Design a protein around this ligand. Structure first.
Ligand SMILES: Nc1ncnc2c1ncn2[C@@H]1O[C@H](COP(=O)(O)O)[C@@H](O)[C@H]1O
Ligand SMILES: Nc1ncnc2c1ncn2[C@@H]1O[C@H](COP(=O)(O)O)[C@@H](O)[C@H]1O
Ligand SMILES: Nc1ncnc2c1ncn2[C@@H]1O[C@H](COP(=O)(O)O)[C@@H](O)[C@H]1O
Ligand SMILES: Nc1ncnc2c1ncn2[C@@H]1O[C@H](COP(=O)(O)O)[C@@H](O)[C@H]1O
Ligand SMILES: Nc1ncnc2c1ncn2[C@@H]1O[C@H](COP(=O)(O)O)[C@@H](O)[C@H]1O
Ligand SMILES: Nc1ncnc2c1ncn2[C@@H]1O[C@H](COP(=O)(O)O)[C@@H](O)[C@H]1O
Ligand SMILES: [K+]
Ligand SMILES: [K+]
Ligand SMILES: [K+]
Lengths: 489, 6, 489, 489, 6, 6, 6
């Protein structure tokens, strides 16, 4: 987006003063929409020396005469040209500026406009800038951040030592990665994206997007009236073990609840019996195992079951021992169908086997599984969208890195999901997702499309739960899926 | 009220 | 119906001009009901040379002076007498005709009335007629078809190379097979059937009908207050296998949910245990089998269980191997009770055994099972109501050929079901239906009656699902059945 | 309209059988709209031998099979060709006919369809036709008349000895004079006018119309925002006497309540004082008279007052003595402004003075005043629209002949008003109307236009009275006028 | 409105 | 109901 | 919709 401001000035010819004005009035209009009539309020605008602060000067000037009181605390040393121009206007219009922050100054104001730093922040905040941010965060005033809350790194969502907690953030052109990933997404509060005059072609060129309702609506597969179950595909789910008898059932119904025509589970006996006793619509094939786990002895039976299907999901509750490893790796090596690879199938995966596969795969790890897979720490991989991009690209796969914001990438295109809530922070929610992806592939969506639609809907179903989110369980989530789908349309 | 009088 | 127009003219004495006038004004009145006040709209009427086009000329004339603009594009070479008469009137009333279609002419109109071909169409549409139909289908205008959308074969529902997609179709006397079967039923849009003056005795003579709410209401069995479970009959369901443990449960509850007094399942042990753990109202008899499947070793036990019952359903999840074949065929040969034969029981059926049976049967295949049964391709049997008629007649049975429009026939009487939606395109919906039919027979309805009421209600229950249809599963369908029954009354 | 059926057959080419069919089904559709679902009812159709009876045969045939019972009592000797054709169809479709009326036959039916005579009736009904009509009128059954209730003369509204009282009458193309004038308008009940296929150009050619909401809406003068009282004209009202001090006030406010800019009354002193004490918005000029009445001594003063005005109303409460006669006649002879001539101004009018006037006039008599004016009996002039036409034409004026249906004519164009109720049957309602006409002329409408809009609104205001109509008085009517105007839009 | 004036 | 079945 | 995406 830095390149987008640049191109809009330098090649399209839009004066940078005009972009700055449009940004500032956007902020004024966003505050009106959120606070109602502004004439009642007193405003403290905190301006740095960069263009973020310039945006602040525009806000401050625009509020002059219309609101109860305005004051600018200017906290930079030097001003950029556009910041300077606008400082100059604010002063000519009769606005008051000071350069010293008094702790007690929060006393006489209702709204703090945070125009200290924007996407123009490198490295940690210390000294007075930090002190003032800590003061604002303790003040209980309403906080409006210009562009990104000061102290968020706009490329990662990381807090650079300290950062402003905003009630409202007004950004320009497009959401930035920092608003989308945590902790930054938390500090952004309610996010508005303002159009400030960039050519639309540039806005759309952006290589990374947030999954939206509109995007998902247009990817949902059609339901032609003259159809039968085979129209909507077949899934095989290879899952469960004597230790984990629930996982297969939740994956299976994830597939069915998104509109798949037929789902078959392959689960060690007698645990296979659990599924059909809960959901007799499922087919649950007994696999005869030595000790409760899949092994190479079950390889041939599973390839056979996979000839009549469109997609295979593998992993949930398989257990992670050597015989499961041999089986999963030999199976994936021979299976010439799309694979959705989750949970324990990921823990035992040999990534050489993903490269040599002609057929496509989706991997769906959480950060702990991603860490072990690439042999890094949880902290190195969490929210690391470039690492996810490299891995999908190197292994010719779609990677769905699960978290409160989920990342879906194929190496070229990267998408971020922001639906869901803490109710999904419970075992078995992941199992449902695996099933949703496989089902959507079965219905003819590509792996990336299936993954995009599934993470969105999976989160949206969680938000539809009637009671406190913390009491949500995977079985209730399954029930809410078709409501999510209906509400999408 | 900021942008328009009607 | 061609014979019906003929008899009404030639033996009852109704001038054919009068039938044509009544048809045309029906179309005008149907459009008013659908579009509201017509004075706002501009109409383009597309007329062939046959009587369909004549009907168009009547529409066009009737709209003269009352609507914003009318134009006829006449696309035939020659006109039939009645078409000619009406072309003559349209012209005298001051109506404009042209004989050349300009692509851009769709520009200046809001409604296209399609009176190009009706039930008088043989063979594929090519040349300009096709071009013009392709233009109308791309135009996004509202389309009203006279009789059947031009390009549907009214005897089969097939698209003859290309065909008009209508928002509204107004037909006369009775729905034609083409409106009822796909793809034609899809292209018909909303269908109105107009009374245009045929004697009622002729209308009712028609040998093939659509199942209606009214028909089904009057077939529902009575619920006398002084009753007990035996009043409402007993069903035995012979089903399931070690591979398919769900099917029995869904069939069993299909029977109970339609009001049957007692349902017993016979299911290999321990899979029989699945049913009562989900629905403890069911009786589920363990059958001791060698390897998880019914065989001749279970023949005597099953005949014994069938002495105390009114109907036997057989097939769902039995598996299809040689020992199942021997068992099913020897069983059906000896059973002297009504049989409902579904799924795998159909796959292994020897049709010689249906002829020699004194007792009645209903077969309920989908097209894939029907194909294998008579040794034809899916495409030869799908929507092939005459083949279904021949087979029911030759084998002294009722055949229920499942699809988005289901055909129910006994060889003399043929009925079409149009309830349901794509939510039933999921395994296990078929199992529920089998149970509904058996239950209705148990309650004293004939096989044809039981089949008619069941397919109607089975589809209607699907439409009552609250959320998106694609998330419907057989277990939710079971729950909706009694709502369907209540809404019927 | 007889000429309209003829032209539509003979020059446009519409088979008369088709007109007859369209008429009959209109009747069926009108009954459905009024009675709801018809399948519950038993129908007795009473058919003569003419085309009215033919229409009946079409109704009867169309009801066959759909309703509970149908029977035709055919009461003619001979059948016209189209009646015969349709008798022939009714019989072929299986309909029962009898030729004898049994008094008790009304017992077994719910609806009597009266297709005995239509617009094809000359001279008085006697014998059995009368007996049967008297029986139907005593029966308390629902009665639907085809075209006009049998026994109304369709050109006058007169009862030819005896006539059917219908709940619903369905006529074709246009309302006939007989439905519009009393007693016929009373016997018609609820009137529907069906389009049966006549070219629209012919329908509109009709020289005589009913005033409609739509017609009046499009005649209401505009209210340009940049206006002042002179934009909306000035009226002078010359009225009242020592005997009749109320009339001036009600006429004056009639003018103001329709939007006139200024109204001046000229009323003998001190009775002029009455007006401004009730409505101080009025100007009320004292005229000094010898004995309480206008005379030639007031001629010059009144011509003077009339120079500054756009229209003059004269007559209400003037009294009728010789000196008033001299004054009214000399005044009208010299006044070179539009005159609205009412009440006593009409009683003393010399009609030679209307011919010699260059300026236009509207006369507004009730039948008693019209009788004295042309020297005929009340019975000769009441509802006599051709006499009203002759008089307007001979005297170059608009005549508004007041009654429950009011006739407005200029000799070329004749209009009928059907708004109002018996609440206007009270002295002073007429005075309000005079004022409304003058006001509308003042605002720039022609005399015929002003008269059309006024009679419509005057009646519509009466219908808006909240309480029983019989308690309506002219002062409440004045209050309701602007509600009428608003409801018009 | 097509069939009836009322 | 007289004119149309739906 | 012109000024803001939410
Ligand atoms: N706090 C949260 N907010 C939104 N989604 C969550 C949250 N916690 C977990 N999830 C989702 O729930 C599922 C957990 O799957 P797993 O990590 O395999 O158990 C993933 O789809 C996560 O993205
Ligand atoms: N309410 C009842 N009325 C008449 N017979 C009954 C009743 N309940 C049970 N039975 C009889 O007991 C046997 C078992 O009844 P059921 O359990 O209803 O099939 C039947 O053969 C019935 O005749
Ligand atoms: N309604 C239907 N239309 C076309 N083919 C069908 C239908 N039902 C079943 N089949 C065929 O039967 C086989 C099994 O069908 P399904 O159970 O829908 O996968 C498939 O290979 C289909 O071609
Ligand atoms: N798209 C659809 N619309 C209506 N009914 C359907 C549709 N797809 C399947 N069905 C019905 O659902 C059941 C499928 O049974 P089976 O083909 O045995 O699995 C049959 O009753 C079909 O007629
Ligand atoms: N608002 C106005 N616009 C134009 N002329 C006016 C206005 N008010 C009064 N007059 C003039 O003053 C005279 C008396 O006006 P009025 O009292 O409206 O008849 C007329 O001849 C008008 O031209
Ligand atoms: N029964 C009635 N229905 C409708 N209008 C009426 C009725 N009686 C009187 N009127 C009207 O009321 C006014 C009577 O005026 P006048 O006859 O001068 O007293 C005229 O406009 C009549 O047309
Ligand atoms: K900021
Ligand atoms: K057509
Ligand atoms: K009549």
């Amino acid at each position: 987006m830095k390149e987008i401001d640049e191109l809009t000035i330098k090649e399209y010819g839009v004066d940078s003063r005009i972009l700055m004005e449009r940004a500032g009035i956007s902020v004024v209009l966003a505050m009106e929409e959120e606070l109602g009539n502004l004439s009642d309020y007193r405003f403290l605008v905190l301006c740095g020396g960069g263009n973020n602060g310039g945006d602040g000067f525009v806000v401050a000037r625009n509020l002059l005469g219309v609101v109860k009181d305005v004051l600018v605390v200017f906290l930079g040393k030097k001003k950029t040209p556009d910041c300077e121009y606008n400082y100059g206007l604010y002063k000519k219009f009769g606005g008051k500026v000071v350069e010293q922050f008094e702790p007690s100054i929060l006393n006489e104001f209702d709204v703090v406009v945070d125009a200290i730093f924007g996407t123009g922040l490198r490295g940690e905040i210390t000294g007075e800038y930090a002190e003032i941010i800590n003061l604002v965060n303790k003040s209980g005033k309403v906080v409006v951040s210009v562009d990104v809350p000061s102290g968020i790194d706009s490329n990662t969502g990381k807090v650079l030592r300290t950062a402003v907690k905003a009630d409202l953030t007004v950004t320009f052109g497009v959401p930035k990665i920092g608003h989308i990933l945590f902790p930054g997404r938390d500090l952004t509060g309610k996010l508005k994206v303002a159009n400030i005059g960039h050519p639309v072609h540039l806005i759309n060129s952006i290589n990374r997007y947030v999954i939206t309702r509109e995007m998902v609506r247009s990817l949902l597969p059609e339901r032609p009236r003259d159809s039968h179950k085979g129209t909507y595909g077949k899934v095989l789910i290879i899952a469960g073990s004597r230790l984990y008898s629930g996982a297969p059932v939740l994956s299976g119904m994830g597939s069915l609840k998104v509109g798949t025509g037929l789902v078959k589970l392959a689960v060690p006996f007698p645990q296979n019996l659990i599924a059909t006793s809960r959901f007799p619509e499922l087919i649950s094939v007994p696999i005869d195992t030595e000790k409760g786990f899949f092994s190479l002895q079950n390889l041939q039976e599973c390839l056979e079951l996979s000839k009549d299907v469109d997609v295979v999901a593998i992993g949930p509750g398989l257990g992670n021992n050597e015989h499961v490893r041999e089986f999963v790796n030999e199976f994936l090596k021979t299976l010439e169908k799309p694979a959705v690879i989750d949970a324990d199938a990921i823990n035992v995966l040999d990534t050489s086997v993903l490269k040599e596969r002609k057929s496509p795969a989706v991997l769906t790890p959480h950060p702990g599984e991603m860490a072990r897979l690439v042999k890094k720490t949880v902290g190195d991989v969490k929210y690391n969208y470039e690492l996810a991009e490299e891995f999908a690209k190197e292994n010719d796969c779609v990677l769905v890195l699960k978290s409160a914001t989920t990342i879906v990438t194929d190496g070229e295109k990267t998408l971020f999901n922001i639906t869901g809530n803490t109710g999904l922070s419970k075992g078995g929610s992941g199992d449902v997702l695996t099933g949703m992806i496989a089902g959507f592939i079965a219905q003819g969506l590509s792996p990336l499309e299936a993954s995009t639609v599934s993470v969105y809907l999976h989160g949206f179903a969680a938000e539809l739960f009637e009671q406190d989110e913390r009491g949500l369980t995977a079985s209730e989530l399954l029930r809410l899926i078709p409501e999510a789908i209906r509400r999408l349309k | 009220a900021w942008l328009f009088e009607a």
